[PDB]
From a paper:
In addition, the structures of two complexes were obtained: wild-type GH18A complexed with hydrolyzed (GlcNAc)6 and an active-site mutant, GH18A-[name], complexed with intact (GlcNAc)6.
Author numbering: 91 to 481
Amino acid sequence: DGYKIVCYYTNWSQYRTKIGKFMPEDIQPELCTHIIFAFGWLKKGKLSSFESNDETKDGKTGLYDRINALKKANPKLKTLLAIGGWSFGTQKFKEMSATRYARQTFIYSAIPYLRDRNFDGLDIDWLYPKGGDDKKNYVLLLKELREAFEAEAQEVKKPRLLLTAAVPVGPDNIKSGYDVPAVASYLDFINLMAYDFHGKWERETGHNAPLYAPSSDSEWRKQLSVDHAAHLWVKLGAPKEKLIIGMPTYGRTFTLSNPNNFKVNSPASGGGKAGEYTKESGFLAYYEVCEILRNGGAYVWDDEMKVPYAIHGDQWVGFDDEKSIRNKMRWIKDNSFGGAMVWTVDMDDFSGGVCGGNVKYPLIGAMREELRGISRGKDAKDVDWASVAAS
């Protein structure tokens, strides 16, 4: 019971190098209440593996089992397998949801797939259903999934498989694809993707996940905040306690058109340069932002948005730190939402050796501390970037 801490683990984090290298055993069993495995896949209309080393074969334990092995040390921990995401696209979801036969084919493939691999549930990450057909068919998919999960539980006399989904924060995306009252009814809980509010696809700097929109925001764009998105879902009929609010352990980066104009909503020429470990322009892991702040980068706290950004030369990154995360946890409690979701567990300072505070998982550890009252350790102090970094 209490607030949830829902952590996404991404299987491609296994390929990162040096400090970035992450494996299932790097997760502390007591860190999260739920771990979601990103991702499974779809083949011939049925739930399947993303990559062969997810599976256990011949002598060799796969990633699925290494993640689920965490439940031996913490029997209260729940695991789910996610299907979807950006690589997956939309066409495969369209075809799988379009007819009852295709939906049932997926569903009766999904139940044994999960049970045989000791998963406690399924997370749907269709990004995104769009238009009237998708809007109806998505509901039909969740309805028939929940239906079948309910029946299975009673027949096998085991706790029912959980059904969850990751959902968008953009008002237009929400309106086009989501019959919210029906969607919420069939889901156990809802992982609100409260990040990617801004990024290199825009011509000015903007924060990845502002709690509140800056005053320099046009009036369309002030809709783009964590606060506005979460309350929009409530207004549309989602129960507050089913809303698990996403928290990014990453930032979105820009290259400033002029290094002297570095505030939020400043002209940008494109994405920030790629980090060594995540190798993606416009994007940095939290521990990559830490490296910047520990090597000459300047830190700005925006008291309007209640989030920080960092500047180094013409490089600009909007990210979340221990300060903004704790304030967001207070906002979760003040609004009675269901808990925090994290994207991802593998981009926090999981080794505890990069950001300088010598605490493993400073960000997620802070979430657990604020929401579930569990200490990060005796002398675990937040990094005060205001004094540590430049200004």
